[PDB]
Design a protein around this ligand. Structure first.
Ligand code: K
Lengths: 12, 87
């Protein structure tokens, strides 16, 4: 629901 | 080193704007500073935060797009492939 929530999943 | 990449100039300018130092970085570092750039410049859609609006931003020039979705990262990864020099 936040930009960081989505962005953080682009990296392991 | 094999785990490092050298961002092309315009992408490096973006990373430096977000606080990065130097010329070579790991992919995790590149993603960290690119994410910070998007967050501090508040380019993401306030209601649907996975959407990033970058029309008129150097990031939009690099993506060749006015916006992209973090949920469908292919255009972002294509931009990185064209803007990261590797070994
Ligand atoms: K915004």
């Amino acid at each position: 629901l936040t930009f960081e929530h989505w962005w953080a999943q682009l990296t392991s | 080193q094999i785990n490092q990449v050298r961002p092309k100039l315009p992408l490096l300018k973006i990373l430096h704007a977000a606080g990065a130092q130097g010329e070579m970085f790991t992919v995790k570092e590149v993603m960290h500073y690119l994410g910070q750039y998007i967050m501090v410049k508040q380019l993401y859609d306030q209601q649907e935060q996975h959407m990033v609006y970058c029309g008129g931003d150097l990031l939009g020039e690099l993506l060749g797009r006015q916006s992209f979705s973090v949920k469908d990262p292919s255009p972002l990864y294509d931009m990185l492939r064209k803007n990261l020099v590797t070994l």
